[PDB]
Design a protein around this nucleic acid. Structure first.
Ligand SMILES: *C[C@@](*)(O)[C@H](CCCNC(N)=[NH2+])NC(=O)[C@@H]1CCCN1C(=O)[C@H](N)Cc1ccccc1
Ligand SMILES: [K+]
Ligand code: NA
Lengths: 249, 26
DNA sequence: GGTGGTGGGTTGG
């Protein structure tokens, strides 16, 4: 998280960390959506240009963490991976199209105050909240700045930018399975996701029901917190069909 | 079923630092 | 330490 602040305990309890088994290292972020399910970004386990073909027993999942490293005794739950569902039509070559992947845990997790899932947007909430100029939270232990290593979970709130701006904000191909969010140069306010926040959720708290909704998934960008540059996230609802498909497995 | 309600914010009936900030945008 | 740098924390000795 670039130009953010330290997290309050359990303000993102659904925040999930992808850890690698050997060498023991962080990969990126994810999101607790179910009790046995976690949702991340596909480039975070499969990006051939970076020689990445991560298997089940290559990865851990650390839920309900706060300190980036030190093993929080009697707080964080470390889980195993049983199955990994990556989107078949994940266009990794061009523009991380359908940058999304799901994770079946060995068996379910018991919730604490530090572990608690986020809601998925329905047909209504998606249209209702995902208007440009509306604000949403992004979390992760990602870079503080592009090269940036925070000791604690980082938080930022950012407005959705409208499709036109994003379309030509970059020379990269933009789809509706993608949305851009962040700050205009003029806006004086700064903020953006950085490399390492990937798979982390773009959450929006609904005003009707005080429930939190993961609207996005930290996908990509060009640099970090740059002027005319906005963080790109995976459009959750425009994939809630495939999402539903593989949970009904 | 119980998602999106933080058992120390929504459940303890509490605001965070900047959920107010989020609300004010809508 | 195991997992930081201080006692508990947000969680034991
Ligand atoms: C894996 C994630 O940590 C990271 C997300 C970066 C988000 N931060 C910003 N700037 N909003 N993803 C990446 O780094 C992706 C994966 C592959 C390369 N990449 C990029 O963002 C490139 N800088 C640009 C890009 C290359 C290929 C396809 C799409 C974008
Ligand atoms: K200790
Ligand atoms: Na920006």
């Amino acid at each position: 998280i670039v130009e953010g602040s330290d997290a309050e305990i359990g303000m993102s309890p659904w925040q999930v960390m992808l850890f690698r088994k050997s060498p023991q290292e962080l990969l990126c972020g994810a999101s607790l959506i179910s009790d046995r399910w976690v949702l991340t970004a596909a480039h975070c386990l499969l990006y051939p240009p970076w020689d990445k073909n991560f298997t089940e027993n290559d990865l851990l999942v650390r839920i309900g963490k706060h300190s980036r490293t030190r093993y929080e005794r009697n707080i964080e739950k470390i889980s195993m991976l049983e199955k990994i569902y990556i989107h078949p039509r994940y266009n990794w070559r061009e523009n991380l199209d359908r940058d999304i992947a799901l994770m079946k845990l060995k068996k379910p997790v018991a919730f604490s105050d530090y572990i608690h899932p986020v809601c998925l947007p329905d047909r209504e909430t998606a249209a209702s909240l995902l208007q440009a100029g509306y604000k949403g939270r992004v979390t992760g232990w990602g870079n503080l700045k592009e090269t940036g290593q925070p000791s604690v979970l980082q938080v930022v709130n950012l407005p959705i930018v409208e499709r036109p701006v994003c379309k030509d904000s970059t020379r990269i191909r933009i789809t509706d399975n993608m949305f851009c969010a962040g700050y205009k140069p003029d806006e004086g306010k700064r903020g953006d996701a950085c490399e390492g926040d990937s798979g982390g959720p773009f959450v929006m708290k609904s005003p009707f029901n005080n429930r939190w909704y993961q609207m996005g998934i930290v996908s990509w960008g060009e640099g970090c917190d740059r002027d005319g540059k906005y963080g790109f996230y995976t459009h959750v609802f425009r994939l809630k069909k495939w999402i539903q498909k593989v949970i009904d497995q | 079923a119980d998602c999106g309600l933080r058992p120390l914010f929504e459940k303890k009936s509490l605001e965070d630092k900047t959920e107010r900030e989020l609300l004010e945008s809508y």
